[PDB]
Amino acid sequence: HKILHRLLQD
Amino acid sequence: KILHRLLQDS
Amino acid sequence: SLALSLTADQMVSALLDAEPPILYSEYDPTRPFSEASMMGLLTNLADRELVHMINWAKRVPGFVDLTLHDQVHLLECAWLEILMIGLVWRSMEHPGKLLFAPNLLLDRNQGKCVEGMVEIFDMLLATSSRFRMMNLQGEEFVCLKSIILLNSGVYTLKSLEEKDHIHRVLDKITDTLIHLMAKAGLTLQQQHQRLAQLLLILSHIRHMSNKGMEHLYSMKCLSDLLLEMLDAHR
Amino acid sequence: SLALSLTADQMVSALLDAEPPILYSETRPFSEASMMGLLTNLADRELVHMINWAKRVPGFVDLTLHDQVHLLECAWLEILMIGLVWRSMEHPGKLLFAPNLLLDRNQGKCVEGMVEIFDMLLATSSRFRMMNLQGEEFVCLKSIILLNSGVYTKDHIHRVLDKITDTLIHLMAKAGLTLQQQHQRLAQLLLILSHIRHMSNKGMEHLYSMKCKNVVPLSDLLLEMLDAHR
Ligand SMILES: Oc1ccc(C(=C2CCC[C@H](c3ccc(O)cc3)C2)c2ccc(O)cc2)cc1
Ligand SMILES: Oc1ccc(C(=C2CCC[C@H](c3ccc(O)cc3)C2)c2ccc(O)cc2)cc1
């Protein structure tokens, strides 16, 4: 759900 | 201040 | 300053001698608890602890050398940190519980009785668990508590010289910590590593104080002294 | 975990290699709106670099995704601030938010609660320059902030934190400090981390206030990072 979840993925 | 006073109390 | 002349062992002896006592709360198990009752109990306890803390600070080497305004500032800044590391130290032998007083032992479930308390409780419990796993020593604890007093408000016209004196005493307490660890038989690597571990915990104690303080001067939004300590943080 | 197999120089080179660039601001800011407009825009772009920086911190990727989130949520403003303090070292009495955005405390008056934090940042910056803080030391401290600031809510982070401690000492020994100067300097650096935490906490308190969030539109990312503290 968090934007941080996505950005932390290569 | 009370703290000021208590610090003075010799 | 005598503080700069004391040996490591003399610094430890001084800090140990200066230790405040452990106070009792007004806790009565036969009396029903509530948000107000619980907070009144902790506030009452903190208030009486502050008086002893002020006199403890007077016996911390180098503290009395400072201007009265600086002494006030450092205590206004660090008082909740000092209360909290004390709480955490007393609670070491009680996993999953916080020992505010010999007659007041609380677990986190009782923390939910006050708004925002259960969050601070868990952080305090985590800190206590850390001290326990490190096997924190009493001599180490009194050094850490004195560091907090001198360090927490050193930032926040010569008086730069006064800031310099604080930095000198802080170096002294560092030397003392290393001395204890070397005495304990730790290798040099183990000494530096443990020193780092202890000082990093101070960042967590700061966080807990600031978060607690934030909730504390919203609870009111208390004795006069405690109200003034709280007010110093606006 | 690869982090532990690293030598001290390798650890240093890895951190130096992970370093984000110094960004530029998107017109001397006075008034609440223009100041926060510029700062939030910069902070948002720095956050994207910070997230990708954290991935390249040895040991960080070995953590679960949720732990990575928790640590970044906890430490992001601390990390922004130590970066700011570092950049501002060569500019006493001033804060270098960007090479084209140099502020003095007089412009902090434009925003409620900014000046107090402005002064704290200035003092921290002055402290770092007085210690002659080195770049290699700086990147170790920033990594420590990431790994430590949310660690107490584990054994892996403990070991990595120990390794960064070893690395800090290694650097100081490399610089020729005696054993006493080494542990004294180690202590001095780590104590400053407490003040960085303090500045972040007092900063965050204003920043996620409803009043502050109304000043200028915020990016969804910056809003989520702010709401993470509650
Ligand atoms: O007025 C107060 C009330 C409570 C405290 C306090 C704490 C610790 C536990 C949590 C507490 C808290 C935090 C957030 C809340 O919303 C409510 C209570 C503060 C405390 C700490 C150490 C000690 O020896 C005695 C008291 C100190 C002064
Ligand atoms: O949403 C925000 C807003 C401002 C900041 C910010 C600051 C620093 C200066 C003070 C500021 C603040 C704090 C409290 C106030 O009441 C007003 C301003 C926070 C910052 C720090 C470092 C960096 O590289 C970029 C931005 C980061 C994220």
Short mmCIF file of N, CA and C in Angstrom, two decimals, chain D residues 106-224:
data_model
loop_
_atom_site.label_atom_id
_atom_site.label_comp_id
_atom_site.label_asym_id
_atom_site.label_seq_id
_atom_site.Cartn_x
_atom_site.Cartn_y
_atom_site.Cartn_z
N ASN D 106 17.95 34.22 9.86
CA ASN D 106 17.00 35.31 9.67
C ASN D 106 15.81 34.90 8.80
N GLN D 107 16.05 33.97 7.87
CA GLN D 107 14.99 33.48 7.00
C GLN D 107 14.20 32.36 7.66
N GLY D 108 14.73 31.83 8.76
CA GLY D 108 14.02 30.81 9.51
C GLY D 108 12.86 31.40 10.28
N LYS D 109 12.91 32.72 10.50
CA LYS D 109 11.86 33.42 11.24
C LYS D 109 10.55 33.42 10.46
N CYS D 110 10.66 33.21 9.15
CA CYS D 110 9.49 33.21 8.28
C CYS D 110 8.53 32.07 8.63
N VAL D 111 9.08 31.00 9.20
CA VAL D 111 8.30 29.80 9.47
C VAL D 111 8.22 29.51 10.97
N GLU D 112 7.03 29.19 11.45
CA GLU D 112 6.84 28.87 12.85
C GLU D 112 7.62 27.62 13.23
N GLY D 113 8.48 27.75 14.24
CA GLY D 113 9.22 26.62 14.76
C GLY D 113 10.52 26.33 14.03
N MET D 114 10.80 27.07 12.97
CA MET D 114 11.98 26.80 12.15
C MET D 114 13.28 27.31 12.78
N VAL D 115 13.24 28.51 13.35
CA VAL D 115 14.44 29.16 13.88
C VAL D 115 15.13 28.33 14.96
N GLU D 116 14.34 27.76 15.87
CA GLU D 116 14.89 26.94 16.95
C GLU D 116 15.64 25.74 16.38
N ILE D 117 15.06 25.14 15.35
CA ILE D 117 15.67 23.98 14.71
C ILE D 117 16.81 24.42 13.80
N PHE D 118 16.66 25.59 13.21
CA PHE D 118 17.73 26.22 12.44
C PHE D 118 18.99 26.37 13.28
N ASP D 119 18.83 26.92 14.49
CA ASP D 119 19.96 27.13 15.40
C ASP D 119 20.62 25.82 15.82
N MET D 120 19.80 24.81 16.09
CA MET D 120 20.31 23.50 16.47
C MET D 120 21.15 22.89 15.35
N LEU D 121 20.66 23.03 14.12
CA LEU D 121 21.37 22.53 12.95
C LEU D 121 22.70 23.26 12.77
N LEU D 122 22.67 24.57 12.96
CA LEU D 122 23.88 25.39 12.90
C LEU D 122 24.91 24.96 13.94
N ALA D 123 24.46 24.69 15.16
CA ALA D 123 25.35 24.27 16.23
C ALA D 123 25.97 22.91 15.92
N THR D 124 25.16 22.01 15.37
CA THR D 124 25.64 20.68 15.01
C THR D 124 26.66 20.78 13.90
N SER D 125 26.39 21.64 12.92
CA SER D 125 27.31 21.86 11.81
C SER D 125 28.64 22.42 12.30
N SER D 126 28.56 23.40 13.20
CA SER D 126 29.74 24.00 13.77
C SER D 126 30.54 22.97 14.55
N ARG D 127 29.84 22.10 15.26
CA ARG D 127 30.48 21.05 16.04
C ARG D 127 31.26 20.10 15.13
N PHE D 128 30.62 19.69 14.04
CA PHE D 128 31.27 18.81 13.07
C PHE D 128 32.52 19.43 12.46
N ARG D 129 32.49 20.73 12.19
CA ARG D 129 33.65 21.36 11.58
C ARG D 129 34.77 21.51 12.60
N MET D 130 34.40 21.74 13.86
CA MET D 130 35.39 21.83 14.94
C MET D 130 36.10 20.50 15.16
N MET D 131 35.39 19.41 14.91
CA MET D 131 35.97 18.08 15.04
C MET D 131 36.72 17.68 13.77
N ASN D 132 36.60 18.51 12.74
CA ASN D 132 37.13 18.20 11.42
C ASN D 132 36.59 16.86 10.92
N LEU D 133 35.27 16.71 10.98
CA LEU D 133 34.61 15.50 10.50
C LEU D 133 34.99 15.19 9.05
N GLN D 134 35.38 13.94 8.81
CA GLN D 134 35.81 13.52 7.49
C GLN D 134 34.68 12.84 6.73
N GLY D 135 34.75 12.87 5.40
CA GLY D 135 33.73 12.28 4.56
C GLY D 135 33.49 10.81 4.85
N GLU D 136 34.58 10.07 5.07
CA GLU D 136 34.50 8.65 5.36
C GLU D 136 33.82 8.39 6.70
N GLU D 137 34.04 9.28 7.66
CA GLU D 137 33.38 9.20 8.96
C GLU D 137 31.90 9.53 8.81
N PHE D 138 31.62 10.56 8.02
CA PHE D 138 30.25 11.00 7.78
C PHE D 138 29.37 9.88 7.24
N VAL D 139 29.87 9.12 6.27
CA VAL D 139 29.04 8.09 5.64
C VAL D 139 28.82 6.91 6.60
N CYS D 140 29.77 6.69 7.50
CA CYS D 140 29.58 5.69 8.55
C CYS D 140 28.48 6.11 9.51
N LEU D 141 28.49 7.39 9.91
CA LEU D 141 27.49 7.91 10.83
C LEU D 141 26.09 7.88 10.24
N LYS D 142 25.99 8.15 8.95
CA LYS D 142 24.69 8.19 8.28
C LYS D 142 24.11 6.78 8.20
N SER D 143 24.97 5.81 7.94
CA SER D 143 24.56 4.41 7.90
C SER D 143 24.11 3.93 9.27
N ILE D 144 24.83 4.37 10.31
CA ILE D 144 24.47 4.03 11.68
C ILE D 144 23.08 4.55 12.02
N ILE D 145 22.80 5.80 11.63
CA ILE D 145 21.49 6.40 11.85
C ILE D 145 20.37 5.55 11.23
N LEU D 146 20.57 5.14 9.99
CA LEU D 146 19.62 4.29 9.29
C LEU D 146 19.34 2.99 10.05
N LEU D 147 20.41 2.33 10.50
CA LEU D 147 20.29 1.02 11.12
C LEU D 147 19.90 1.06 12.59
N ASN D 148 20.23 2.16 13.26
CA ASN D 148 20.00 2.25 14.70
C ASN D 148 18.65 2.85 15.07
N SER D 149 18.22 3.87 14.34
CA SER D 149 17.12 4.72 14.79
C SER D 149 15.78 4.01 14.98
N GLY D 150 15.62 2.85 14.36
CA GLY D 150 14.39 2.10 14.52
C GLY D 150 14.66 0.66 14.90
N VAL D 151 15.87 0.40 15.40
CA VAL D 151 16.27 -0.96 15.72
C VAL D 151 15.63 -1.50 17.01
N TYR D 152 15.15 -0.61 17.88
CA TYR D 152 14.60 -1.07 19.16
C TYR D 152 13.08 -1.03 19.19
N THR D 153 12.47 -1.76 18.26
CA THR D 153 11.05 -2.06 18.32
C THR D 153 10.84 -3.56 18.08
N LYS D 154 17.09 -8.67 14.62
CA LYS D 154 17.75 -7.66 15.44
C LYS D 154 19.24 -7.97 15.57
N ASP D 155 19.56 -9.25 15.70
CA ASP D 155 20.95 -9.68 15.87
C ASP D 155 21.79 -9.32 14.65
N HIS D 156 21.15 -9.30 13.49
CA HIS D 156 21.84 -8.93 12.25
C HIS D 156 22.23 -7.46 12.25
N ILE D 157 21.28 -6.60 12.60
CA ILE D 157 21.54 -5.17 12.66
C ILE D 157 22.60 -4.87 13.71
N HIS D 158 22.54 -5.61 14.82
CA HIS D 158 23.53 -5.50 15.88
C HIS D 158 24.94 -5.73 15.35
N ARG D 159 25.11 -6.82 14.61
CA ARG D 159 26.41 -7.19 14.05
C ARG D 159 26.88 -6.19 13.00
N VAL D 160 25.95 -5.69 12.19
CA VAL D 160 26.31 -4.71 11.18
C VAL D 160 26.70 -3.40 11.85
N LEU D 161 25.95 -3.01 12.88
CA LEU D 161 26.28 -1.81 13.64
C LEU D 161 27.66 -1.93 14.27
N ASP D 162 27.98 -3.11 14.80
CA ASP D 162 29.31 -3.39 15.32
C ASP D 162 30.37 -3.24 14.23
N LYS D 163 30.05 -3.70 13.03
CA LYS D 163 31.00 -3.63 11.92
C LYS D 163 31.29 -2.19 11.52
N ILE D 164 30.26 -1.35 11.52
CA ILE D 164 30.43 0.06 11.19
C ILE D 164 31.25 0.75 12.28
N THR D 165 31.10 0.29 13.52
CA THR D 165 31.93 0.77 14.62
C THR D 165 33.39 0.43 14.37
N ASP D 166 33.64 -0.83 14.00
CA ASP D 166 34.98 -1.27 13.63
C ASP D 166 35.55 -0.40 12.51
N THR D 167 34.68 -0.04 11.57
CA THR D 167 35.08 0.76 10.41
C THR D 167 35.45 2.19 10.82
N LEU D 168 34.66 2.78 11.72
CA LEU D 168 34.96 4.11 12.24
C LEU D 168 36.31 4.15 12.94
N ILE D 169 36.57 3.15 13.79
CA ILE D 169 37.83 3.04 14.50
C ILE D 169 38.99 2.86 13.52
N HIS D 170 38.79 1.99 12.54
CA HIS D 170 39.77 1.74 11.49
C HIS D 170 40.19 3.04 10.79
N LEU D 171 39.21 3.89 10.48
CA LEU D 171 39.48 5.17 9.84
C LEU D 171 40.33 6.08 10.73
N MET D 172 39.95 6.17 12.00
CA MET D 172 40.65 7.01 12.96
C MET D 172 42.09 6.54 13.18
N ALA D 173 42.28 5.22 13.23
CA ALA D 173 43.62 4.65 13.34
C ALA D 173 44.42 4.96 12.08
N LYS D 174 43.74 4.90 10.94
CA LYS D 174 44.33 5.24 9.65
C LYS D 174 44.82 6.68 9.64
N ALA D 175 44.07 7.56 10.30
CA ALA D 175 44.40 8.98 10.37
C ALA D 175 45.51 9.26 11.38
N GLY D 176 45.86 8.25 12.18
CA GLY D 176 47.00 8.36 13.08
C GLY D 176 46.66 8.71 14.52
N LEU D 177 45.39 8.61 14.88
CA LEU D 177 44.97 8.89 16.25
C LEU D 177 45.46 7.81 17.21
N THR D 178 45.81 8.21 18.43
CA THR D 178 46.16 7.25 19.47
C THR D 178 44.90 6.52 19.92
N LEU D 179 45.09 5.46 20.70
CA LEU D 179 43.97 4.67 21.21
C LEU D 179 43.01 5.51 22.04
N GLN D 180 43.55 6.46 22.80
CA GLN D 180 42.71 7.31 23.63
C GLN D 180 41.91 8.28 22.78
N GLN D 181 42.57 8.88 21.79
CA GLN D 181 41.91 9.80 20.88
C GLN D 181 40.84 9.08 20.07
N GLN D 182 41.08 7.81 19.76
CA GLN D 182 40.13 7.02 19.00
C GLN D 182 38.81 6.83 19.74
N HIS D 183 38.87 6.39 21.00
CA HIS D 183 37.63 6.12 21.72
C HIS D 183 36.96 7.44 22.13
N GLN D 184 37.76 8.47 22.36
CA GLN D 184 37.20 9.79 22.66
C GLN D 184 36.47 10.36 21.45
N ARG D 185 37.06 10.21 20.27
CA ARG D 185 36.44 10.72 19.05
C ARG D 185 35.22 9.89 18.66
N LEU D 186 35.31 8.58 18.86
CA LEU D 186 34.17 7.70 18.62
C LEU D 186 32.98 8.16 19.45
N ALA D 187 33.23 8.41 20.73
CA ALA D 187 32.19 8.86 21.65
C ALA D 187 31.59 10.20 21.23
N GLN D 188 32.45 11.17 20.92
CA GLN D 188 32.00 12.50 20.51
C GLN D 188 31.06 12.44 19.31
N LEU D 189 31.42 11.63 18.31
CA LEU D 189 30.60 11.49 17.12
C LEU D 189 29.25 10.89 17.46
N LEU D 190 29.25 9.82 18.25
CA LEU D 190 28.03 9.09 18.54
C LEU D 190 27.08 9.88 19.43
N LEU D 191 27.64 10.74 20.28
CA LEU D 191 26.82 11.59 21.14
C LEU D 191 26.05 12.63 20.32
N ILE D 192 26.65 13.07 19.22
CA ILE D 192 26.01 14.03 18.32
C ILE D 192 24.77 13.42 17.67
N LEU D 193 24.79 12.10 17.49
CA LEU D 193 23.65 11.37 16.94
C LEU D 193 22.40 11.54 17.80
N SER D 194 22.60 11.70 19.11
CA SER D 194 21.49 11.98 20.01
C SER D 194 20.84 13.32 19.70
N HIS D 195 21.66 14.31 19.36
CA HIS D 195 21.14 15.64 19.04
C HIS D 195 20.45 15.64 17.68
N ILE D 196 20.97 14.84 16.76
CA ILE D 196 20.34 14.67 15.46
C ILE D 196 18.96 14.04 15.62
N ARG D 197 18.85 13.08 16.54
CA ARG D 197 17.55 12.50 16.86
C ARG D 197 16.62 13.57 17.43
N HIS D 198 17.15 14.38 18.33
CA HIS D 198 16.38 15.44 18.96
C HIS D 198 15.86 16.43 17.93
N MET D 199 16.73 16.85 17.02
CA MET D 199 16.35 17.79 15.97
C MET D 199 15.27 17.21 15.06
N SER D 200 15.41 15.93 14.73
CA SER D 200 14.42 15.23 13.92
C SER D 200 13.07 15.17 14.62
N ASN D 201 13.09 14.83 15.91
CA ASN D 201 11.86 14.73 16.69
C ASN D 201 11.13 16.07 16.79
N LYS D 202 11.86 17.11 17.17
CA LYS D 202 11.27 18.44 17.32
C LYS D 202 10.83 18.98 15.96
N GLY D 203 11.58 18.63 14.92
CA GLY D 203 11.24 19.01 13.57
C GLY D 203 9.97 18.34 13.11
N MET D 204 9.93 17.02 13.26
CA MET D 204 8.79 16.21 12.87
C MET D 204 7.50 16.67 13.54
N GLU D 205 7.62 17.10 14.79
CA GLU D 205 6.48 17.54 15.58
C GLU D 205 5.75 18.70 14.90
N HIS D 206 6.51 19.65 14.37
CA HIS D 206 5.91 20.76 13.64
C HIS D 206 5.46 20.32 12.26
N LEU D 207 6.30 19.56 11.58
CA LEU D 207 6.07 19.21 10.18
C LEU D 207 4.79 18.42 9.95
N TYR D 208 4.42 17.52 10.87
CA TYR D 208 3.19 16.76 10.65
C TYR D 208 1.99 17.35 11.39
N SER D 209 2.17 18.52 11.98
CA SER D 209 1.03 19.25 12.53
C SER D 209 0.12 19.63 11.38
N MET D 210 -1.19 19.63 11.63
CA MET D 210 -2.16 19.94 10.58
C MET D 210 -1.95 21.34 10.01
N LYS D 211 -1.53 22.26 10.88
CA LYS D 211 -1.23 23.63 10.49
C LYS D 211 -0.11 23.70 9.47
N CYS D 212 0.94 22.91 9.69
CA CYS D 212 2.10 22.93 8.82
C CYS D 212 1.82 22.27 7.48
N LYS D 213 1.02 21.21 7.50
CA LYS D 213 0.69 20.47 6.29
C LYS D 213 -0.20 21.28 5.35
N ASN D 214 -0.80 22.34 5.87
CA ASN D 214 -1.68 23.20 5.08
C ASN D 214 -0.96 24.32 4.34
N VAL D 215 0.30 24.57 4.70
CA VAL D 215 1.07 25.67 4.12
C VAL D 215 1.25 25.53 2.60
N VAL D 216 1.67 24.35 2.16
CA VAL D 216 1.92 24.09 0.75
C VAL D 216 1.52 22.65 0.43
N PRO D 217 0.98 22.39 -0.78
CA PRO D 217 0.75 21.01 -1.19
C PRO D 217 1.99 20.13 -1.05
N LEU D 218 1.81 18.95 -0.46
CA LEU D 218 2.91 18.01 -0.27
C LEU D 218 2.80 16.84 -1.24
N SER D 219 3.93 16.27 -1.61
CA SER D 219 3.92 15.06 -2.42
C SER D 219 3.36 13.92 -1.58
N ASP D 220 2.78 12.92 -2.24
CA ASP D 220 2.21 11.78 -1.54
C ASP D 220 3.27 11.04 -0.74
N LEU D 221 4.48 10.98 -1.28
CA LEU D 221 5.59 10.30 -0.62
C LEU D 221 6.00 11.01 0.67
N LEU D 222 6.13 12.33 0.61
CA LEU D 222 6.53 13.09 1.79
C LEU D 222 5.45 13.03 2.85
N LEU D 223 4.20 12.99 2.41
CA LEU D 223 3.06 12.90 3.31
C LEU D 223 3.06 11.56 4.05
N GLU D 224 3.32 10.48 3.33
CA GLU D 224 3.40 9.16 3.94
C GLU D 224 4.56 9.05 4.93
#
